[PDB]
Every structure is written in structure tokens, then in C-alpha cells.
Design an enzyme around this catalytic site. Sequence first.
Site, PDB file in Angstrom:
ATOM      1  N   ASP A  31     -56.045 -48.882 -21.594  1.00 49.18           N
ATOM      2  CA  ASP A  31     -57.092 -49.807 -21.121  1.00 49.18           C
ATOM      3  C   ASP A  31     -56.496 -51.105 -20.519  1.00 49.18           C
ATOM      4  OD1 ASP A  31     -56.562 -50.556 -23.893  1.00 49.18           O
ATOM      5  OD2 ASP A  31     -58.355 -51.823 -23.804  1.00 49.18           O
TER       6      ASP A  31
ATOM      7  N   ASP B 229     -32.321 -24.879 -25.941  1.00 49.80           N
ATOM      8  CA  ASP B 229     -33.569 -24.729 -26.711  1.00 49.80           C
ATOM      9  C   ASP B 229     -33.890 -25.982 -27.564  1.00 49.80           C
ATOM     10  OD1 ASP B 229     -31.335 -24.067 -28.273  1.00 49.80           O
ATOM     11  OD2 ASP B 229     -32.265 -22.372 -29.295  1.00 49.80           O
TER      12      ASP B 229
ATOM     13  N   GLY C 170     -30.750 -22.501 -31.897  1.00 49.70           N
ATOM     14  CA  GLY C 170     -30.485 -23.801 -32.521  1.00 49.70           C
ATOM     15  C   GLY C 170     -29.531 -24.727 -31.783  1.00 49.70           C
TER      16      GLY C 170
ATOM     17  N   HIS D 106     -55.945 -54.251 -30.489  1.00 47.97           N
ATOM     18  CA  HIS D 106     -55.197 -53.002 -30.591  1.00 47.97           C
ATOM     19  C   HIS D 106     -53.862 -53.059 -29.821  1.00 47.97           C
ATOM     20  CE1 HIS D 106     -57.733 -52.453 -26.982  1.00 47.97           C
ATOM     21  NE2 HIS D 106     -56.809 -51.612 -26.550  1.00 47.97           N
ATOM     22  N   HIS D 107     -52.890 -52.300 -30.329  1.00 40.44           N
ATOM     23  CA  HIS D 107     -51.483 -52.314 -29.874  1.00 40.44           C
ATOM     24  C   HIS D 107     -50.752 -53.640 -30.182  1.00 40.44           C
ATOM     25  CE1 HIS D 107     -53.222 -48.921 -27.945  1.00 40.44           C
ATOM     26  NE2 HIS D 107     -53.257 -49.352 -26.696  1.00 40.44           N
TER      27      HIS D 107
ATOM     28  N   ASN E 234     -30.070 -20.132 -27.864  1.00 38.12           N
ATOM     29  CA  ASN E 234     -28.987 -19.720 -28.760  1.00 38.12           C
ATOM     30  C   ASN E 234     -29.336 -20.042 -30.211  1.00 38.12           C
ATOM     31  OD1 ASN E 234     -28.657 -22.479 -28.697  1.00 38.12           O
ATOM     32  ND2 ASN E 234     -26.727 -22.444 -27.521  1.00 38.12           N
TER      33      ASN E 234
ATOM     34  N   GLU F 225     -44.914 -41.388 -22.779  1.00 37.50           N
ATOM     35  CA  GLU F 225     -44.170 -42.483 -22.157  1.00 37.50           C
ATOM     36  C   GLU F 225     -42.652 -42.298 -22.209  1.00 37.50           C
ATOM     37  OE1 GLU F 225     -46.713 -42.888 -24.318  1.00 37.50           O
ATOM     38  OE2 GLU F 225     -48.182 -44.242 -23.415  1.00 37.50           O
TER      39      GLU F 225
ATOM     40  N   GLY G  33     -26.594 -39.955 -23.618  1.00 33.21           N
ATOM     41  CA  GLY G  33     -26.629 -38.649 -24.271  1.00 33.21           C
ATOM     42  C   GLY G  33     -27.864 -38.350 -25.097  1.00 33.21           C
TER      43      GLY G  33
ATOM     44  N   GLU H  21     -23.876 -29.054 -32.077  1.00 37.75           N
ATOM     45  CA  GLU H  21     -23.787 -29.678 -33.400  1.00 37.75           C
ATOM     46  C   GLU H  21     -23.075 -28.771 -34.407  1.00 37.75           C
ATOM     47  OE1 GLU H  21     -26.373 -32.911 -34.616  1.00 37.75           O
ATOM     48  OE2 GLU H  21     -24.870 -33.339 -33.061  1.00 37.75           O
TER      49      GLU H  21
HETATM   50  C1  LIG Z   1     -48.908 -43.970 -26.924  1.00 38.04           C
HETATM   51  C2  LIG Z   1     -50.216 -44.398 -26.275  1.00 38.04           C
HETATM   52  N1  LIG Z   1     -50.343 -44.363 -24.941  1.00 38.04           N
HETATM   53  C3  LIG Z   1     -51.473 -44.741 -24.340  1.00 38.04           C
HETATM   54  C4  LIG Z   1     -52.577 -45.158 -25.079  1.00 38.04           C
HETATM   55  C5  LIG Z   1     -53.845 -45.576 -24.308  1.00 38.04           C
HETATM   56  C6  LIG Z   1     -55.017 -44.773 -24.710  1.00 38.04           C
HETATM   57  C7  LIG Z   1     -56.000 -45.249 -25.616  1.00 38.04           C
HETATM   58  C8  LIG Z   1     -56.466 -46.690 -25.840  1.00 38.04           C
HETATM   59  C9  LIG Z   1     -57.966 -47.022 -25.705  1.00 38.04           C
HETATM   60  O1  LIG Z   1     -56.052 -46.844 -27.191  1.00 38.04           O
HETATM   61  S1  LIG Z   1     -57.200 -43.898 -25.803  1.00 38.04           S
HETATM   62  C10 LIG Z   1     -56.420 -42.743 -24.673  1.00 38.04           C
HETATM   63  C11 LIG Z   1     -57.001 -41.372 -24.354  1.00 38.04           C
HETATM   64  C12 LIG Z   1     -57.128 -40.471 -25.567  1.00 38.04           C
HETATM   65  O2  LIG Z   1     -57.737 -39.300 -25.071  1.00 38.04           O
HETATM   66  P1  LIG Z   1     -58.006 -37.999 -25.934  1.00 38.04           P
HETATM   67  O3  LIG Z   1     -56.964 -37.822 -26.999  1.00 38.04           O
HETATM   68  O4  LIG Z   1     -58.215 -36.874 -24.951  1.00 38.04           O
HETATM   69  O5  LIG Z   1     -59.374 -38.344 -26.718  1.00 38.04           O
HETATM   70  P2  LIG Z   1     -60.936 -38.180 -26.241  1.00 38.04           P
HETATM   71  O6  LIG Z   1     -61.028 -37.434 -24.924  1.00 38.04           O
HETATM   72  O7  LIG Z   1     -61.566 -37.319 -27.308  1.00 38.04           O
HETATM   73  O8  LIG Z   1     -61.579 -39.537 -26.175  1.00 38.04           O
HETATM   74  C13 LIG Z   1     -55.252 -43.362 -24.165  1.00 38.04           C
HETATM   75  C14 LIG Z   1     -54.297 -42.724 -23.159  1.00 38.04           C
HETATM   76  C15 LIG Z   1     -52.411 -45.181 -26.470  1.00 38.04           C
HETATM   77  N2  LIG Z   1     -53.392 -45.571 -27.245  1.00 38.04           N
HETATM   78  N3  LIG Z   1     -51.243 -44.806 -27.035  1.00 38.04           N
HETATM   79  C1  LIG Z   2     -32.705 -37.998 -28.808  1.00 35.89           C
HETATM   80  C2  LIG Z   2     -31.460 -37.388 -29.464  1.00 35.89           C
HETATM   81  N1  LIG Z   2     -31.489 -36.991 -30.753  1.00 35.89           N
HETATM   82  C3  LIG Z   2     -30.415 -36.462 -31.332  1.00 35.89           C
HETATM   83  C4  LIG Z   2     -29.215 -36.295 -30.635  1.00 35.89           C
HETATM   84  C5  LIG Z   2     -28.012 -35.679 -31.390  1.00 35.89           C
HETATM   85  C6  LIG Z   2     -27.561 -34.424 -30.732  1.00 35.89           C
HETATM   86  C7  LIG Z   2     -26.413 -34.358 -29.887  1.00 35.89           C
HETATM   87  C8  LIG Z   2     -25.235 -35.334 -29.892  1.00 35.89           C
HETATM   88  C9  LIG Z   2     -23.827 -34.727 -29.966  1.00 35.89           C
HETATM   89  O1  LIG Z   2     -25.438 -36.003 -28.652  1.00 35.89           O
HETATM   90  S1  LIG Z   2     -26.303 -32.622 -29.308  1.00 35.89           S
HETATM   91  C10 LIG Z   2     -27.708 -32.017 -30.190  1.00 35.89           C
HETATM   92  C11 LIG Z   2     -28.109 -30.558 -30.115  1.00 35.89           C
HETATM   93  C12 LIG Z   2     -28.511 -30.102 -28.719  1.00 35.89           C
HETATM   94  O2  LIG Z   2     -28.859 -28.724 -28.914  1.00 35.89           O
HETATM   95  P1  LIG Z   2     -29.245 -27.706 -27.754  1.00 35.89           P
HETATM   96  O3  LIG Z   2     -30.067 -28.452 -26.713  1.00 35.89           O
HETATM   97  O4  LIG Z   2     -29.843 -26.520 -28.421  1.00 35.89           O
HETATM   98  O5  LIG Z   2     -27.824 -27.377 -27.053  1.00 35.89           O
HETATM   99  P2  LIG Z   2     -26.762 -26.163 -27.338  1.00 35.89           P
HETATM  100  O6  LIG Z   2     -27.351 -25.219 -28.377  1.00 35.89           O
HETATM  101  O7  LIG Z   2     -26.725 -25.385 -26.043  1.00 35.89           O
HETATM  102  O8  LIG Z   2     -25.411 -26.750 -27.666  1.00 35.89           O
HETATM  103  C13 LIG Z   2     -28.293 -33.084 -30.915  1.00 35.89           C
HETATM  104  C14 LIG Z   2     -29.543 -32.926 -31.792  1.00 35.89           C
HETATM  105  C15 LIG Z   2     -29.205 -36.747 -29.311  1.00 35.89           C
HETATM  106  N2  LIG Z   2     -28.111 -36.657 -28.563  1.00 35.89           N
HETATM  107  N3  LIG Z   2     -30.322 -37.273 -28.760  1.00 35.89           N
HETATM  108 MG   LIG Z   3     -29.367 -24.552 -28.512  1.00 35.32          MG
END
Ligand SMILES: Cc1ncc(Cc2c([C@@H](C)O)sc(CCOP(=O)(O)OP(=O)(O)O)c2C)c(N)n1
Ligand SMILES: Cc1ncc(Cc2c([C@@H](C)O)sc(CCOP(=O)(O)OP(=O)(O)O)c2C)c(N)n1
Ligand SMILES: [Mg+2]
Lengths: 546, 544
Positions: free
Chosen positions: B31, B426, B455, B117-118, B453, B54, B399, B459
Site C-alpha cells: 500500500d 535441487d 540433496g 503496519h510494517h 542429486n 522481494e 555465494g 556440503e
Molecule cells: C513481505 C510483504 N510484501 C508486501 C506486502 C504488501 C501487502 C499487504 C499490505 C496491505 O500489508 S496485503 C498484500 C496482498 C495479499 O494478498 P493475498 O495473500 O492474495 O490475500 P487476499 O487476496 O485474500 O486479500 C500485499 C502484497 C506485505 N504485507 N508483506
Molecule cells: C542463502 C544460502 N544459504 C546457505 C548457504 C550454504 C550453502 C553453500 C555454501 C558452501 O555456500 S552450498 C549449499 C548446498 C547447495 O546445494 P545444491 O544446490 O543441491 O548443489 P549441489 O548438490 O549440486 O552441490 C548450501 C546450503 C548458502 N550459500 N546460501
Molecule cells: Mg543438490
Amino acid sequence: HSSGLMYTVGDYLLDRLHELGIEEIFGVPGDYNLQFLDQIISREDMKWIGNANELNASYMADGYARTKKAAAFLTTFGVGELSAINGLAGSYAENLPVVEIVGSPTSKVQNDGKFVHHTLADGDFKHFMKMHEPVTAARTLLTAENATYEIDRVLSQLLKERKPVYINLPVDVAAAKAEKPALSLENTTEQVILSKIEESLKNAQKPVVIAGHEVISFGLEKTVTQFVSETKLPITTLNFGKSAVDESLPSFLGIYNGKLSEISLKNFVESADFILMLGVKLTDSSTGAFTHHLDENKMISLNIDEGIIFNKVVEDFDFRAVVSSLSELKGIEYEGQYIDKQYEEFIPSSAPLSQDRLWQAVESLTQSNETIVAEQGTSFFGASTIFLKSNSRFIGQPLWGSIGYTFPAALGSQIADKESRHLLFIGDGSLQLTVQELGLSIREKLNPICFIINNDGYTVEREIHGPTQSYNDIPMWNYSKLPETFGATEDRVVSKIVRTENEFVSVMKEAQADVNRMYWIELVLEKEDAPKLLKKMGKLFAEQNK
Amino acid sequence: HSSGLMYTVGDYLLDRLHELGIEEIFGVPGDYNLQFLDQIISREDMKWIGNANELNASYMADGYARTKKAAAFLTTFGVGELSAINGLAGSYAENLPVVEIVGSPTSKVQNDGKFVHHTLADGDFKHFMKMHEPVTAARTLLTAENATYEIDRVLSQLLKERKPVYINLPVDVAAAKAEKPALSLENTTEQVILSKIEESLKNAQKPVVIAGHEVISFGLEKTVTQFVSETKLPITTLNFGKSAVDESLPSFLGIYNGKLSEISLKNFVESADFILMLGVKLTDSSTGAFTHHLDENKMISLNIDEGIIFNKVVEDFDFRAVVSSLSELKGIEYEGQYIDKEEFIPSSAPLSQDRLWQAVESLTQSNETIVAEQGTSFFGASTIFLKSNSRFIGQPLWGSIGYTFPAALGSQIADKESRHLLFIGDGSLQLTVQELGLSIREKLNPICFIINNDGYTVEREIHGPTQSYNDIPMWNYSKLPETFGATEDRVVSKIVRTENEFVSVMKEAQADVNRMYWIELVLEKEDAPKLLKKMGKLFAEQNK
Ligand SMILES: Cc1ncc(Cc2c([C@@H](C)O)sc(CCOP(=O)(O)OP(=O)(O)O)c2C)c(N)n1
Ligand SMILES: Cc1ncc(Cc2c([C@@H](C)O)sc(CCOP(=O)(O)OP(=O)(O)O)c2C)c(N)n1
Ligand SMILES: [Mg+2]
Ligand SMILES: [Mg+2]
């Protein structure tokens, strides 16, 4: 052993978390926390529950905290912690006791200023903790020698304020030697406050209690419920802190929401000759956009950080201590009337589902010992006014109001109390932010009843501004098919599509009867349809933005 | 006749974004930003592309920036901006010019300290901008009286450093009156640097150029490519900044990654008598865990923030200006040799990691962008030799797993004529899968490979190969597009198990430019490419 047949910093941390009542740790692994994770896995008394992403883990920990009254999740340095910070911010806003543990590089790597992964390549490993200052009550970077005091310091602050705290745990520090905890972690102005409350309640002809979210923060719901039960005092809550007391209490009036309150409730609350507010914060969504009339001159309010005794601000008291001493008060008995309770019945027809009828049906069909979780959108505003049954609870996030929160949060809360059946109401738009925790729900064999409101976009936003603008549209998924695609079989999750009132009642009863499977129910409603309260509140939000 | 007888701050911001070359704005509505959103929707010269969440929006803007060379995304106050901050942090770390716009409550609401709110219900609307300080080059909370000055200040800083900047835009401020911009947005030290480089290259018998990510940050890839082509100078890049030069150049040696480099390349780079580094940062994942050997006594390095000329530090220079003057240097021509450069024959054998990346290298074409996620994908794909006019997106410093899926889509929107090939694990896909809806709505045609693969294999290679925390719930990945609403005229989905199947599907995908390909590859959890087998142990030692 029950049968009668090196300790490290990591063990110390986990022992203290156990003391807080935490039996599950959420989050996402990374190389900087794997050795500590080993220690979590080895624990007999606590389970690692790995999430798909860290934002969802933070939301899940928040929901768990609302029910378990403490929570913890684990992330990796930089990329994990920063992904979770919006969840922790929500926990700070609504005052939930969540511990975030961040695994960080070894002390030597940090001291050497190395350009390692998950950094800004400037050798500074302290930016990210600094960024958490506004949304944490306490934070610490642990060392081998500071660890036991620092852990105890920050967790004692969690116990004191019930706000989130933050522990940065370098790899080598978790493995460092420690010794077991010796002791566990766990009045004049306080007695004066109690005497003024007692005096005011006994002299009042029409007292009213207002309970809020900070009651929930401290797990004082049962305490306040007992006080009100014994004294018969009229009580209301805002939608911020809904279920701070048991809504089956005969003196529970309903939800006060400023000028959007039911008329008899509004008149009662606003004509009361004494007001006791317990843990309440008056926000836009919980006061009908600041249209409440609560006279400070006739009020004693108690919050975590301050109390106001008929306009006199006091800070030198413990909120929990004062609330817990309310049932030392004897001889308080309300002898007046409350307000008329409307009869609750729902008779389904073949008509297509509408918002107002949906919430009437949910109110009727929800049972005792259930938890209703409702997302910002039509779900929160519709479900907010339903009268809950005995020992039933509610989770909503009207202050922070981060859409998507409720799906992981419902799952964390469901894990926290497996005996309380969770019913989730989440919008199509909101589910799209956090849908990946469906995998966790399947792996953990959780059995909530989930309703997804498919109304072809962001209806709450349409009600505020730009009802036919394209930014209020979202890509339509085949929501009912999500469990199957995420690996669920029919003996784990039952998926449905519901269009009519008859269908809704049938599925709701079927779901409620079957406690050993999860239900995943796509509700189809019109984009232009909003519950009465939201039709009103939408225009108030719009006005607020002008 | 015979007788003889408005513009607003929101428009100003959008005009400046247009000037930066931005034609698409990502984000999520709230909003507090909807009225500004109306202004975006009304524009003929740019399009709103709404994301599911976001964090994904910030990732998408980053990928867009890597290709378009500027980007913008829009969030709502508190909940939106804090959800995106990890993406913006990554853009800061890897130096991408991304502008985040945050819609905030009216100035009256903020001034009254209302519990809206927020917020944290403390009347303070400045906490979240302060939290962005370490991950932004500049930030502003606009007022009606400072709005144009402040927009220009922060966007000028974006142009100067190519790091992310932050604009908090209150509802009433966006609708306030403004005037159209009067001006467009845009020494001896530089001459000495150029002269010293010229002299060193003239006198060198075995020079090497190392190009890095800051070249990509400034859109200097074609400039550096032209310089190297003219001079025939030996050139390498790290995997951090891969495709900072065109890898089809005769003098392109391959990727330098410390002791994990190919032997002939390592020997060449580490015996060079002069090293010119352009926009390089030496990080753990891009130097074989700091096993590089680069002698500063033989080096001139130029970075955005700093230059080092044979150990002497310099700062009073424009990085872009110096790099852009390299083709004016004279008497530079390398007259030496480089290093020595197998046909891939598929079988019915189940897909394995090393063979997978051999196949990809053999099948990749010109005019493609390869995107590779941290995990087996990045470590395998990072050593593939790219064809002419082909590029690479990887994020080895920050990363953040999950980044690459939204980033690949943003980059693909940025250049419709470069076919994007995404390799994502994955585990990583599970963090950001919801942008599949956007890809369908926008009718994007990337080729996506999902490495199933079972998992987190990267890691497992670091620590706890059979520990339960390295397992993930197995989705039916190939079925995702259908469930997210795709029809067969839009997305082609398949599961691939063998080498023959892979070659067939990749060729099929490359031949079909009018549809998106969603390809689940099945590989074993124990299987890792050779570079990752080595890197896994080096990470493990680093955490001792
Ligand atoms: C992380 C995040 N992003 C954006 C918003 C803004 C926002 C709300 C502001 C007002 O808080 S309400 C809304 C739409 C929710 O729609 P819905 O889940 O389809 O629910 P319904 O169609 O049943 O009303 C958004 C994007 C938020 N609250 N939080
Ligand atoms: C947002 C986030 N959370 C956690 C990590 C830690 C992390 C890595 C660190 C080292 O950056 S590598 C990895 C696993 C990725 O697994 P995959 O996508 O299944 O890849 P593959 O199986 O092919 O090796 C994690 C959870 C990260 N890099 N970023
Ligand atoms: Mg994997
Ligand atoms: Mg909706």
C-alpha cells in the site's frame, strides 16, 4: 539413565536452549555451521528441522515461539542471517522470544581479514551483527573465554523482555571446552500498582480489561484467563494479541477494533468507568485506523517497558511479576451484565463461496483445542472476528504484517503443540512468497488443515488502491496440485478444490475427522469479494496514505 | 484569425532510471508504494515486472544489472526492504549497479510517529535505512524540498562506483511537484598510470592480463576484449568475473584458480614477467582457497577503489577512464606463444559430473549466457571455454544459493538475444522456485537444468557426507512448470538420466528458441566434479 544403568561451548548453548523449553531447531545449513549442526543431530532431546530457505526458517521459529514460548533457528554467516532478518524484525515488532544462531568463520580467518565467501571482501566480519542492532534485544560475538557468560547474558535478556536475541558462533568456538551450567537461567512500586488495580476494580461499576500481545509473549494467557474467570470481569482483546485470553470465558465481549467494533461491544468498552490494559499496543490495523476511544484518565495500563497509572508513567516494575500477582487479589467480583452473544449457526447451501459466509462457517465448524492462523488479506480480517472455542488459539501478525509469514509460522506452531490442530487460512498471493516449506510439512508428517484462498490476486490491495491495476494480478498456480508436485502421496496429504458452501462444509468435516493426514484445500472466491471488516478497513488504509 | 485576435517527483525518478538505460522494474507491491506503481504502469518506456517475493526481486535486479548495466527494484517499507536486503548485500559485494526504491508512509504519518503496519510500533521510521548502511554506496529518505537533489546525488554515486544505492520514497513525496531535470547525469595520475602500463607491456617478454568482476560492473567487457585482440596479450580471468573478456580470443588461456588451475595455465601465469590486473578481487573460491602466487613486485593492479603500481598505492584515478584508454597505448604487441589447447562421444551410461561438463562444453554455442549456481554447477561450469559473444553469471564471493534462478531470468529479460542456460542444484532451486510463475507470464525462453542429486552435494563434500542435514525433501522438479500453470506451448519439461539423453535434449533445447526448457538431470549424491572434490577439502581445512 531412566533404567538406572569433552563438554564444549556447543553443548552449553544446547543445554541452555533445552532449559528454555526448545525441543526443535529450525534453519538452513552452511559450511560455517556444520560442526555445530553435528552437535544438534547428536542430541537425544532436540531435533534439527531443516528449512528450504532462511526467511521461512525465521517465520517458522516465530510461530513456534508463539506456542512453545521460546524458539531457536540456525543460519550461516552473511547470506543466511541477512535472508532471515525480516523474520527476526517481525519477532522484534510483535515481541516473540526467538534466538538466532549464526555460524561464522573461524576466529583465525576473521582475525586475518580473509576475503572468504559470504563477505563483502573487505575483511570485516562485524557488519552483519551491527545491522541486527535495531531488531534484537541483545547480540553477541562468542569467543572461547566469553562464551558461557555471553550465552547466559543474551538468553537472560530473552527471558527478561521476550524479544529476539542473536548469537554469532565461530566454528572453532563451538568446539572449545566449557563446563556445565551450575545454576539455571531463571517490589514496592509493584505492590503499589497492585493496590491501585485492586482499589479501582472494587470501586468500578463497569470495569473492562483489555489484553494484548505481550500477554502471549510471556505465556501469561492461562494466568489472565484464570484471573478473569474467577473475578467475572468483562474482557476484550484487540486483533493484535487475539487469544491473549480464552474467548470461551463468559465475560469475553469480542474484539475491540475502534469504530469498526460491533456496536454493543464498542459502547461497553468506551463507557467503562475503569480500564485495565495488559500488554496492549494500539496500532492502525488493531484500532480501525486509530478510531479507538480509550480514556487515559480512567486507565491503568501495563506493558513490558512501561506502565501508566491514571496518567503517571512508571518504568520500575516487572510486567510478568505484576500480571502473575493479580490472582493474589481477593474479593473482586463483577455483578453487572456483559453484552448479548449472537447465536452461532451455519446452514450450508449450494451457493458459490462468499467471504462473509466463509467466516461464519469457520466460526461454527472450528472446534476446541485448535489454533487458527490467518494471513494479512481477506483471511486475517475475516477470521479476526470469529469467536474461538475453549482452549483455542489464534496467530496473526497485524503490526509487522509480512505476507507469507503464516505458512511457515503455522507449521512451526503445529510442531510446538502437536495436540492442537492448526487451521491455516492463507491467500494465493501470500502463499507464493513461502510455498517451499510444503516439503518440510511432508517430511515431518505434520497434519494441519490448510485453506488457500484463490481469488485471482491481491484482493486486500485491490480494496486499498487500484482494484483493476495489473500489479494486483499474480500468476495463477494450480494450488491444489502443489503437495503432489512437492512429493506428497495420498496417505500423507489430501488435496481438494472447493467452490460452494456445501463442498466447504463436507471437506471441513472430513478434514476435522481425519487427524492423521494433512489437508490442502484450494478455496475459489471472487477477486472483488472482501469480508465486511476489510471493505471498511481498505478505505481507511487508503485515507491513511493520502 | 481574420479579426487579428503536472510533473512530479515520481516522474523525475522514473526519467532518471530511463537515463540509466533501465526498461524494466522488478519488485513486490504494498500500500505504501501503489500510487508510485501507477506512475510506472503509465510509462511507455518501461514495464513493471512483479515478483512473487522481494528476495527474488533483488536477485532478479542483480542479474538484470549484470547484463543491462543498471537495474531498479521496488519494495514496501519494512517488510519488503528487509526481505530484499540479502540480495542488495550480494549486489554490494560483487559490485552491481542496482537501485532499490522503498515506498514509505506519508511524511505526516512519519512525523506523528504513528504505530502503523510494517513498523516496530515505536514511531521511528529511520531504522531500516540505517540497517542498509553497510550494503549501499549511498542512501536517501526523500522530502518534497530535497527530492531532485537527493535522487541525483545517489544516482550519481551509482554511476561513480557501480555499487547499489537506496531511495526511500514517501507516498506524498512521490506525488509532490517537480521540474524536469536541467542537466544530464554523467589528470596526471591517470597519465602516469597509462605510461607505466605502456612501458611495462613494451618491455615484457611474457606479460599476462588478469580481468575481474569490476570490468563486468562497468560494462567494460567489449573494451577489454578489443584491447586484448589488438595487442594479442595473454589473458586469464578468475571464476569471479568469468566472461570479463570474450573467451574465444586466441590469447585467452582459461581460468586461473590458484593451485587448482590447469598446470600449463598456472605455470604461464605464475612465471609471467609482468602482470596487469583489471578489476580483480582474490577470494577463497576464486583462488583455490588462497593458493595463488601473484608477485606484487611484477604487478600493476587497477580496481574501482584503488590502484597498486609495483607496490605503490594510488587512489586519485577514474578506473573506467583508465581501462577505456588502454587501446590508445602504442608499441604493444605480444609476439610469443600461449599454452596448448577431445571430441565428446555420448553413451547410454548414466550421467556423471565430469562427463556432464565435458558435454556442456562441447555443445555450448555463441550468443549464450551460462548461469551456474554454487554447488556442483558452479564448480563444473566455471572451467568451460565459452564461445564467441557468450557470457557467464556466477556469484562466488557472496555465494547465496538460490540467487541464480531469479538472476538468470533478470539477465534474460535484459538481453532477449542471448540464450540463457541455467545450471542450478535441487537444494538451491528450493530457495527461489516461485519465480517460475513470472517466467511463464513473461514468456521467457531460457534453458534450465536442475541437478537432482538428492540433496546438498557440495556440503557433503565439505563435511558430513551422510548426515541428515545434507538431505532435502525430493520434489518432482520436472512437474513444476505444469503445476505453476505452464502449458506445453510455453515450457518443455523432461527428466534426463543418461549421456545420450542429455546430448539429445540440450541440442533439442538449443534448436527450439521459442519455448522455455525445464530439464531435471539425475546424478548421484556422491558424485562431484574434480574441481569441487578438491575445493570441498580446502573449505574443510579453512574451517579447522
Ligand atoms: C513481505 C510483504 N510484501 C508486501 C506486502 C504488501 C501487502 C499487504 C499490505 C496491505 O500489508 S496485503 C498484500 C496482498 C495479499 O494478498 P493475498 O495473500 O492474495 O490475500 P487476499 O487476496 O485474500 O486479500 C500485499 C502484497 C506485505 N504485507 N508483506
Ligand atoms: C542463502 C544460502 N544459504 C546457505 C548457504 C550454504 C550453502 C553453500 C555454501 C558452501 O555456500 S552450498 C549449499 C548446498 C547447495 O546445494 P545444491 O544446490 O543441491 O548443489 P549441489 O548438490 O549440486 O552441490 C548450501 C546450503 C548458502 N550459500 N546460501
Ligand atoms: Mg543438490
Ligand atoms: Mg488473493
